[PDB]
Write a protein that holds these residues in place. Structure first.
Motif, PDB file in Angstrom:
ATOM      1  N   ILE B 482       0.831  -1.199   0.000  1.00  0.00           N
ATOM      2  CA  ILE B 482       0.000   0.000   0.000  1.00  0.00           C
ATOM      3  C   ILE B 482       0.868   1.253   0.000  1.00  0.00           C
ATOM      4  O   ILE B 482       0.468   2.296  -0.535  1.00  0.00           O
ATOM      5  N   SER B 483       2.072   1.173   0.575  1.00  0.00           N
ATOM      6  CA  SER B 483       2.989   2.308   0.533  1.00  0.00           C
ATOM      7  C   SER B 483       3.378   2.659  -0.897  1.00  0.00           C
ATOM      8  O   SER B 483       3.614   3.832  -1.208  1.00  0.00           O
ATOM      9  N   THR B 484       3.455   1.661  -1.779  1.00  0.00           N
ATOM     10  CA  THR B 484       3.639   1.952  -3.195  1.00  0.00           C
ATOM     11  C   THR B 484       2.382   2.572  -3.789  1.00  0.00           C
ATOM     12  O   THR B 484       2.462   3.510  -4.590  1.00  0.00           O
ATOM     13  N   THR B 485       1.210   2.065  -3.395  1.00  0.00           N
ATOM     14  CA  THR B 485      -0.048   2.565  -3.938  1.00  0.00           C
ATOM     15  C   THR B 485      -0.308   4.007  -3.516  1.00  0.00           C
ATOM     16  O   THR B 485      -0.965   4.759  -4.246  1.00  0.00           O
ATOM     17  N   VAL B 486       0.212   4.418  -2.362  1.00  0.00           N
ATOM     18  CA  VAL B 486       0.047   5.800  -1.928  1.00  0.00           C
ATOM     19  C   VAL B 486       1.119   6.716  -2.520  1.00  0.00           C
ATOM     20  O   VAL B 486       0.861   7.904  -2.741  1.00  0.00           O
ATOM     21  N   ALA B 487       2.313   6.188  -2.804  1.00  0.00           N
ATOM     22  CA  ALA B 487       3.347   7.006  -3.430  1.00  0.00           C
ATOM     23  C   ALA B 487       2.984   7.368  -4.864  1.00  0.00           C
ATOM     24  O   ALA B 487       3.351   8.448  -5.341  1.00  0.00           O
ATOM     25  N   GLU B 488       2.270   6.482  -5.563  1.00  0.00           N
ATOM     26  CA  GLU B 488       1.812   6.799  -6.911  1.00  0.00           C
ATOM     27  C   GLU B 488       0.862   7.990  -6.901  1.00  0.00           C
ATOM     28  O   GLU B 488       0.907   8.839  -7.799  1.00  0.00           O
ATOM     29  N   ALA B 489      -0.005   8.071  -5.890  1.00  0.00           N
ATOM     30  CA  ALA B 489      -0.930   9.193  -5.785  1.00  0.00           C
ATOM     31  C   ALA B 489      -0.249  10.446  -5.253  1.00  0.00           C
ATOM     32  O   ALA B 489      -0.680  11.561  -5.567  1.00  0.00           O
ATOM     33  N   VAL B 490       0.800  10.286  -4.445  1.00  0.00           N
ATOM     34  CA  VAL B 490       1.576  11.436  -3.993  1.00  0.00           C
ATOM     35  C   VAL B 490       2.309  12.071  -5.168  1.00  0.00           C
ATOM     36  O   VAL B 490       2.252  13.289  -5.373  1.00  0.00           O
ATOM     37  N   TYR B 491       3.005  11.250  -5.959  1.00  0.00           N
ATOM     38  CA  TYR B 491       3.630  11.741  -7.182  1.00  0.00           C
ATOM     39  C   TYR B 491       2.585  12.329  -8.124  1.00  0.00           C
ATOM     40  O   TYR B 491       2.810  13.379  -8.737  1.00  0.00           O
ATOM     41  N   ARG B 492       1.430  11.668  -8.241  1.00  0.00           N
ATOM     42  CA  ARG B 492       0.358  12.187  -9.086  1.00  0.00           C
ATOM     43  C   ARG B 492      -0.074  13.577  -8.636  1.00  0.00           C
ATOM     44  O   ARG B 492      -0.375  14.440  -9.468  1.00  0.00           O
ATOM     45  N   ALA B 493      -0.094  13.818  -7.324  1.00  0.00           N
ATOM     46  CA  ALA B 493      -0.481  15.114  -6.781  1.00  0.00           C
ATOM     47  C   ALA B 493       0.694  16.076  -6.644  1.00  0.00           C
ATOM     48  O   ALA B 493       0.485  17.293  -6.653  1.00  0.00           O
ATOM     49  N   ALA B 494       1.923  15.567  -6.533  1.00  0.00           N
ATOM     50  CA  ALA B 494       3.086  16.447  -6.511  1.00  0.00           C
ATOM     51  C   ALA B 494       3.167  17.281  -7.791  1.00  0.00           C
ATOM     52  O   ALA B 494       3.500  18.470  -7.743  1.00  0.00           O
ATOM     53  N   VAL B 495       2.847  16.685  -8.947  1.00  0.00           N
ATOM     54  CA  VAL B 495       2.974  17.386 -10.230  1.00  0.00           C
ATOM     55  C   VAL B 495       1.870  18.427 -10.433  1.00  0.00           C
ATOM     56  O   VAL B 495       2.044  19.357 -11.233  1.00  0.00           O
ATOM     57  N   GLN B 496       0.743  18.321  -9.729  1.00  0.00           N
ATOM     58  CA  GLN B 496      -0.225  19.413  -9.741  1.00  0.00           C
ATOM     59  C   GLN B 496       0.374  20.627  -9.039  1.00  0.00           C
ATOM     60  O   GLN B 496       0.973  20.508  -7.968  1.00  0.00           O
ATOM     61  N   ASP B 497       0.243  21.784  -9.683  1.00  0.00           N
ATOM     62  CA  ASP B 497       0.905  23.028  -9.288  1.00  0.00           C
ATOM     63  C   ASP B 497       2.419  22.859  -9.158  1.00  0.00           C
ATOM     64  O   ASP B 497       3.037  23.378  -8.226  1.00  0.00           O
ATOM     65  N   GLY B 498       3.005  22.124 -10.104  1.00  0.00           N
ATOM     66  CA  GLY B 498       4.439  22.020 -10.308  1.00  0.00           C
ATOM     67  C   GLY B 498       5.373  22.081  -9.110  1.00  0.00           C
ATOM     68  O   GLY B 498       6.125  23.054  -8.935  1.00  0.00           O
ATOM     69  N   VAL B 499       5.367  21.024  -8.300  1.00  0.00           N
ATOM     70  CA  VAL B 499       6.162  20.954  -7.074  1.00  0.00           C
ATOM     71  C   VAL B 499       6.765  19.559  -7.048  1.00  0.00           C
ATOM     72  O   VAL B 499       6.127  18.588  -6.622  1.00  0.00           O
ATOM     73  N   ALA B 500       7.984  19.445  -7.563  1.00  0.00           N
ATOM     74  CA  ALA B 500       8.816  18.256  -7.522  1.00  0.00           C
ATOM     75  C   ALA B 500      10.170  18.680  -8.069  1.00  0.00           C
ATOM     76  O   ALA B 500      10.234  19.328  -9.109  1.00  0.00           O
ATOM     77  N   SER B 501      11.243  18.381  -7.347  1.00  0.00           N
ATOM     78  CA  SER B 501      12.563  18.465  -7.960  1.00  0.00           C
ATOM     79  C   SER B 501      12.625  17.548  -9.167  1.00  0.00           C
ATOM     80  O   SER B 501      12.988  17.976 -10.267  1.00  0.00           O
TER      81      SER B 501
END
Lengths: 496, 520
Positions: B482-501
């Motif tokens: 599930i930690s992988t399943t939540v990281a996919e959604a975190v990355y999915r939401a990190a790219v909204q409003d351009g916030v990711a190194s």
């Protein structure tokens, strides 16, 4: 292909506290930490050493059993060594014997799955023919004593094997606390030669020599290879190990007792404390060993071996070798005499578990009263506990750890009193390698003071290490009076 | 002279016959070779023959810094540890019984009386400004539900550390802990002369503010993108931090946000059965305290996601207290203004899904549930009270009071209901379901900010992982998936409003979901 290295792996380094020596916990002041670069890694308190140990003591009483405490001191042997050792000043008699005999059996059997006998060289004899290369990881100076048990017969239970280090460490840990030998000057070692109870072998997580309870003519020279590669390094170090008393002890001692400084406490140190109890009884009795005859019930290896001890002790004030057999009486090995109609001035006790329904014969006959059972496992022997043994109601002490009678108070006799002062004088004088050598137990009488008629009749109180210093004053005389040594010091020698 | 004693680069016996000779040990270790699974099976078999009420924790803390990689191997194989071995007994034992004891090889303590040496203290270990992630510092105030423990607070953070990398694959090599010793107020610790910490009292002033302000700014200065979060830490201080420094720094709060996440996750889990949009979800809060409003703020922060204004959402919420529902013109409103008897509240509010983080033992009465039960067919009970036997109600009776037509979720672990018609499920709702994956995904994105949306996609990623027994939240056994399943959604939401190194196609969560507990 061969080499794999990276530019990214970091341990988030710990600095100058991973080594146990001088870790001293929070005992570092602001000047010390900021010198050693511990700024912010220790808890920002300051605690004196004696207050720090008490913090562990109040911690230590919070545990109920005697085994979980061994796990805690195991945690403090690798970190902050001085605490583990200077805690013993706060309570030595209770803790240090408890560290050794009652707790290890539960620690070695249930929990000796630790792979951290750090100073230990858990050397195998199957694959390792080259063993001196292990010491390359560990010079001849600043090395005093070393223990190398084959782990064959622990007190509670023999022959567990790879877990024999906790024992060898236990002797060393008790060695220094009793004898003051610097821990840096001692190494622990235990050879997983096998000697495996099938229960230990059947365990999948044994972590030791696999199915190698191996003996025969090959055994001794394998050990002899190790004993000669130790004296090749240094004959100035006491290889004081513990094995079963049955065969190896005398065979090894006969092999290396003359040329090297090696001994075992069970067969050598124990009889010394017994001699100290005899002299402690003769002081109030006033009957010397010449007119005092002894019995040796059981005729065990340590029991009948004490016949040479009592005889050579009588050599100071007594007659030739033939006189000992007339002044000593062995019994109970084959059921001798199907028992004492005369000569009862000093009675030993059962070298055998058989507990003997009291025999008030020694109570009735004319004698100097001195009988002791001298066996721990059954907590009884030819005599019952001293209260029931006081059928005449005079004094007698037990080798079994016993309580006072009640006035009518004796102390337990243990060989723990001997081997610290024995090896300390060897660490002092630097002896390369007899009864006159080993005759240091008389110093126990110098610190015994059984002069009080009723109260104190025991060898010595347990809470004092100054008796070991008094043994040193008696042991250092082995250079001039007894034979070969390397002693040139003054009588004081306050910090050896 | 024992070489190669570093915990991370030591594998005990696991080193093969060649490595034992090539790395200069030459027989100091016994003549056995144990696969790391065999060593774990040995430790597991060893651990069980003990008191096991806090006996284990003594063995684990020595095993922690004696051998770092194994500890997570054995800890990977667990359902008991995730809370009992290292989220309750440290407080029960290590925090108080072993307070005169230290474990600080990794991680550090500093003091409010010395703001000067931090930047000199932090570089004690060789720390590259690049390689770090998820540094945690707590002041040990309000740890769990007991109170100030002074400088013991590390055992919490170091424990959370054990849950981070075993749960979210964070590298402990790149992970550090800290303790802000600002002075405790527990009368025992100060009277205890053997407490290895500051004897001073609590300080709540500009010295404190300048302290933390001069600690957080150098936490990111010395190394940026470090996920700074504070565990079981003063809420009046905690919320103050996020509103103040959370705009230009990556910070989150397990006490305030990860809890508000998993609570959110359980709301959608019922919404999958409720068939209702979250916007029109009218609820009642029970706490009205410092923490119960935080999860209410996160729920309200997600209530706008499905089309609720600020005024309508707070109108869609009623907070309750034993004096009464928080009201307008009440002189002591306690500095919260989303408000405007309880049994009367449920009567007209008709809330379909109500929770209470208010700690009031067993205030849920059969007459209370029935009003919600009769009004709403599938209501959701949520006794989020963390204490095991101080929750608002027993689940078995609540399901029986509503004829199983209601939903439950518990902060503390519970057994199934077993209402004899059909057997239901647990609803474990700890924080472990959120922060490890929110740590892994943000390590992958390298987000300068951990935004609301980013948090919401985590909880509603949890919903898919466990959804229609009738469990609202998953089982803790299957955590690394599930930690992988939540990281996919975190990355999915990190790219909204351009916030990711970083940026990637997302075949490389597993490469940054590292420290898989085996070696090589």
């Amino acid at each position: 292909y061969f080499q794999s290295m990276s530019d990214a792996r970091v341990p988030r380094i710990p600095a100058a506290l991973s080594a146990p020596s001088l870790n001293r916990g929070v005992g570092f002041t602001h000047a010390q930490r900021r010198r050693l670069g511990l700024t912010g890694r220790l808890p920002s308190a300051v605690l004196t050493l004696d207050q720090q140990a008490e913090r562990v003591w109040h911690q230590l009483q919070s545990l109920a059993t005697e085994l979980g405490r061994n796990l805690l001191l195991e945690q403090l042997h690798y970190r902050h060594e001085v605490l583990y050792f200077k805690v013993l000043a706060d309570h030595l008699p209770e803790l240090m014997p408890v560290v050794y005999t009652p707790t290890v059996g539960e620690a070695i059997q249930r929990f000796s799955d630790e792979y951290r006998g750090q100073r230990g060289l858990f050397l195998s004899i199957d694959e390792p023919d080259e063993i001196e290369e292990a010491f390359n990881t560990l010079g001849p100076e600043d090395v005093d004593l070393i223990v190398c048990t084959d782990a064959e017969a622990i007190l509670g239970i023999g022959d567990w094997g790879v877990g024999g280090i906790q024992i060898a460490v236990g002797k060393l840990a008790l060695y220094t606390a009793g004898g003051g030998v610097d821990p840096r000057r001692c190494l622990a070692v235990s050879l997983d030669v096998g000697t495996d109870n099938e229960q230990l072998l059947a365990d999948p997580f044994y972590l030791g020599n696999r199915h190698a309870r191996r003996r025969g003519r090959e055994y001794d020279e394998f050990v002899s290879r190790y004993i000669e590669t130790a004296q090749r390094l240094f004959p100035r170090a006491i290889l004081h190990f513990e094995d079963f008393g049955p065969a190896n002890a005398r065979k090894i001692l006969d092999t290396y007792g003359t040329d090297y400084c090696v001994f075992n406490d069970d067969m050598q140190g124990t009889g010394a404390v017994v001699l100290a109890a005899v002299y402690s009884g003769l002081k109030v009795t006033g009957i010397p060993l010449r007119d005092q005859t002894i019995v040796v019930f059981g005729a065990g290896t340590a029991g009948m071996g004490i016949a040479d001890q009592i005889r050579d002790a009588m050599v100071a004030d007594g007659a030739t070798l033939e006189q000992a057999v007339s002044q000593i009486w062995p019994i109970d090995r084959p059921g001798l005499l199907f028992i004492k109609i005369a000569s009862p001035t000093i009675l030993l006790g059962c070298s055998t578990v058989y507990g003997a329904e009291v025999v008030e014969a020694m109570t009735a006959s004319c004698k100097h009263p001195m009988i002791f059972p001298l066996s721990n496992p059954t907590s009884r022997m030819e005599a019952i506990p001293a209260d029931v043994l006081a059928w005449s109601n005079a004094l007698l002490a037990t080798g079994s750890p016993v309580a006072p009678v009640e006035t009518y108070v004796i102390g337990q006799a243990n060989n723990v009193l001997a081997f610290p002062g024995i090896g300390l004088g060897v660490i002092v004088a630097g002896a390369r390698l007899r009864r006159m050598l080993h005759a240091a137990a008389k110093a126990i009488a110098h610190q015994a003071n059984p002069t009080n008629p009723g109260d104190s009749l025991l060898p010595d109180v347990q809470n004092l290490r100054a008796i070991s210093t008094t043994v040193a004053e008696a042991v250092y005389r082995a250079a001039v009076q007894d034979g070969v040594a390397s002693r040139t010091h003054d009588d004081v020698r306050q910090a050896i």
